[model samples]
Target: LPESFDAREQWPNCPTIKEIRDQGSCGSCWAFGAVEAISDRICIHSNVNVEVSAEDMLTCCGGECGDGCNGGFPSGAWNFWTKKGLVSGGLYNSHVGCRPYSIPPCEHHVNGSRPPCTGEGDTPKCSKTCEPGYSPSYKEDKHFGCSSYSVANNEKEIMAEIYKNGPVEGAFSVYSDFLLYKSGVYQHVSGEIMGGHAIRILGWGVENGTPYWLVGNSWNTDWGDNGFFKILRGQDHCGIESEIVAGMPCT
Candidate 1:
C-alpha cells in the first residue's frame, strides 16, 4: 500500500488561488484546467491566495501551445506562466460584463489580433500572439496513453512527495464517463465520462484496504464529490499500473 497521508505532518503550503467560475458556453476545459494549476502555484509562490480568472488567461494565453478554445497542451499554459507574468496583473473576466459568479460571457471575436475588451475565448489566438516560448517541445513524456495506468502508480509516489515537499502539477484525460461521478467515493461510481484534459493530483488520503488517491476536478460542485474524486491505487483506472502517467510533474 502507498504511504498514508499524515495531517500532523507539514505538507507543501501550496497556494490556494481563487476558484474560477466557468464562463458561459465556452468549452475551454483544457485551458481552464492548465491555467488553474498555474494560478494556484503562482499565487502560492507570491505568498498570496489571489485567484486568477481562467477566462482571462484562456482568452490571452492560447494559440501558442495549440488551438485554445477546443483543446491544447499543458506546456502552453506553463509558457504563459513564464512569459506573460499572468499573476503580475490582477484577475479579471474574459471581458463579458458577467460578474465573477455569473455565467461567463461567450463572445467570439476572432478578428485581427486580440481586442482590449473581447469576450470570445482566446486560447489559440493567445498562443499565436505569444510565439517561441509557447511552442510545443514535442516531448514524448508529455503524452499519456488512453489506457495508461502509470498515473495511478506515480500518483502514490507523487502524494508521498507532496507531503514531503509541496503541491505539484497533475494532469489526466477527462473522458465522458468521468462526468457521471456524483458524490461519495469515486471508484464505485460508473457512468459515461466526458473526454477532456484536466490537471489535479492526489492531494492526500486512503480509504478502505485499497489505497485511494485524492484528485480535483473542474466539472463544478454539481458534478463529482464537490469537484474532487478518488481512485484506487492498484486499480488500472488510476494509471498507477498503466502506461498513462496522467502527467504528474513534480518539481
Candidate 2:
C-alpha cells in the first residue's frame, strides 16, 4: 500500500465501490455489508454495474446464514452467496429488481439519528416476485457468486486486500456516540455499546496525524459523513479490522 491509498483513486475510471445504501430499520447490516462488498467487487472485477440484492440474502438465506434482522454473520452471508447467488435490486421503493428490498424506510430524526429499535429489527419477508406486474430487466443468469472467502489477519493485510480486490465486509462494535457522528475520525467517546453493525471498508487515510479507515454505512446519505464514517485505524479500533472478510467474485 502507498503511504496513503484509496481504492476509488486507484481505479479512477471504475465506478465507486463506496456507493452508500440504506438498510432502513433492519438489523440486516450483515446482509447489507456483505452484499454491498460483493456487488462492488463484481463490478470492479467484471466491469459490470449492478446492485446485488441485500433483501435477497436477508429474507432467503436465513436458513443457512442465521437470523435475518435479529442478527447475522458477514462470513455466513458470504457463504450463502457463494452457494445460492444473489440477483439485482435497488434500495427500498425503487421497484428496481428481480427482487427488491421489501422493507419500508423507517422514520429518522432531523439529525439523521435512527429512532429506538423495536427489538424485532423489522425483518422483511422473502419474496421472489417482481414488483406487482413488471417483469425483471435482468436474467437469473445475471446473479453473481463468490469462489472463496477469508478473513484478514491485520491492518496491513486488510488495506492491501481492499486495494487489490475492492472493498471488504467489516463489522465492529457500534457505540452510542456513533449515531451523533457528523465527521472526523471517530472513536468510542460515550454511550453504551449499541450492538454489532457491519459496513464496507472502502479505503483509508490519515488526517491531522490521525489514521482512519473509510467505511460505507447502510444508513442513507443524511447520516454520518454523507452515509459513511471514518474510524481510528491500524490499532483495530473498535474491532473494525478484527472481523474483515473478502472474497473473489466468480464473474
Candidate 3:
C-alpha cells in the first residue's frame, strides 16, 4: 500500500491543486475549501482544469451555506453545487474565468499595495451573470456536482476517499498553536479552541513516525507552508478525521 500521496504531484498538470486561495478578512473557509476541493476533483476526473467559483458559493448560496464571511458548512457548499452550480473563477484579479474572487488579499503590518485586512469583508452579491466580455453566459458556464455526501468518520476511509477521488473538505477545531505552526506534523500541544475552521485535506503521509493528513488552507500562501499544513492523523486531532465531505463532478 502506498504510504504517501500528494494530489499536486500526482497531477502535475492540474494547477488548481497547487494554487492557494486567500479568504481575505472573511470567514469563507467553507466556500473556499469546498470549491477548491471540488475544482481539484473536477480536474482529476475530467482532465479539465477549471477554477470553479468560490464567489458563487459564498454569495449565491448565502442562506443555505450559512452567513457569508461568517462561517458556513462544507456540505451546504457541495449541495449548492449539485443543485445551483458554479461558474468558472480563478484567484483574485486573474480575470481568466467568468467570475474571479472579488476579495483582495492583505497582510497585517506589512507595507504593500494592498491594505491590511482589517474589518470583516462584505459578502459579494450573487450576480448570477458572467462578467462583461466573457464568452459564455453565466448559466452556460456553470458546472455542477453529480452528488455530494459526507465520508465516513474513519481515518482510512477519509484517506481512501481522497486517494480515490482527490481532495476532500474537512472542518476541525483550531487552536492558537495552529496559527504559530510553520512546519512538521502538527499536534496540538497547547492553547484553547479558538474556533472551527474548514480546509481541504488532499493527502497523507508519515513524518518522523507521526502520520499526518496534508491539508490546504484558505489563509493564503503566506501562512503555514504555502497555505498547506499537516495535522496529526489517525488519532482524529481536533476532529480533523471525524468529518470529511466529497463529491463527483457532473461530467
Candidate 4:
C-alpha cells in the first residue's frame, strides 16, 4: 500500500463502491453504515449493485444492536446481517416494506441538512409488506449475508483492509458542531456531545496538511460536505478509528 489509498479511486468502475445513504432522523447509523459497506462489498464481489435494506436490520436486529431510532452498535448490525441477511430497499420517503424503508421522512426546514431530532426518536414498527407495486426480487431465499467480521486494530491495518476489500463501518463520538460542518478536516470544536454515531469510512486523504479519513454520514446529501465529512486521521480523532469494523460478504 502507498502512503495514501482511496477505495473509490481504486474501484471507480464498481457502481456501488461509493453509494452514500441517509439514516434520516432515526439513530440507525449503525444499520446504515453496516448495510452500506455490505451492499458495496457484495457488489464488488459479485459485480452487481444491490441496496441492502437498513430498515430490515434496524427493525429486526434489535437484540444486540439496540432499539431503532435510539443508538445501536455497528458490530451488532454486522452480526445481524451475517445471521439473517437483508433484502433490498431505497431511501426513506420512497416506499415501505420488504424493499422500502418503513419510516417516513421527517420534516426539515430549508437548508436544514437533516430532520430535527425528535424527543427520544421513536422506533418504527417492522413490517414485511412491500409497497403496493414494488415487490422485492430478492426474497428471503435470495437475500445476502456476511461470512465474518473483524475489528481493524490500527490505522494502517484498516486502510490496507479497505483497499483490499471495500469501505468499512466505523463509529465515533459526534459533537453538536458536527451538524454545522460544511467542509475541512473536522475536529471537536464547541458543542455538546450528541452521542455515539456510526458511519462508513470510504477512503482517506490529506487536506491543508491535515490527514483525514473520508467518511459517509447518514444525514442527507445536503448535510455536511455533500453527505460526507472528514475527520483527523492517525490519532484516532473523535475515536473514529477506535471502533473500526469490516466484514466479508458471502458471494
Identify the leading candidate in terms of lDDT: 3
lDDT of 2 at 232: 94
Best by TM-score: 3
- Give the CA lDDT, 0 to 100, for residue 80 in model 1: 56
lDDT of 2: 0.78
lDDT-better candidate, 1 vs 3: 3
lDDT of 1 by residue, 1-251 (tens): 33665321332454342233333344555555554555454433344443444544566665774554666655555555455534221223332211121233332221223222233543322221211232233121121111111223455555654454333345544455554565444553454544544455535566665665555555444345655566665554533223222222222
Q: In model 4, state the lDDT of residue 62.
A: 72
TM-score, one value per model: 0.59, 0.90, 0.95, 0.89
Which pairs clash inside model 4? none
Q: Write the per-residue lDDT of candidate 3 for residues 1-251, one digit (tens) a residue.
A: 38998988988878898888888888898998899999998999996889998888999997888999888989999999999888998788888688889998876323456767774788889888877788699889989899999998898788788888899999999988787777999999898888989999888999998999999988777777877899998988899977688899987
- After superposing candidate 3 on the true structure, give the runs of residues whose Cα lies further than 4 Å from its correct spot: 108-114
Off by over 4 Å in 1: 1-24, 88-153, 188-193, 234-251
- Model 2 — TM-score against the truth? 0.90
Candidates ranked, most accurate by TM-score first: 3, 2, 4, 1
lDDT of predicted model 4: 0.76
| Residue 225, candidate 3: C-alpha displacement in angstroms | 0.8
Error of 1 at 247 (Å): 12
Q: Encode model 4's per-residue lDDT on 1-251: one tens digit a residue.
A: 66666777787667555666666567788888888888788877775667788877888777688877777878888887777778777777666435667655542222653556454557776666555666644454236565657766598888887888889999999888787888999999788997888889988888888988988877666667777888999998889889987778787
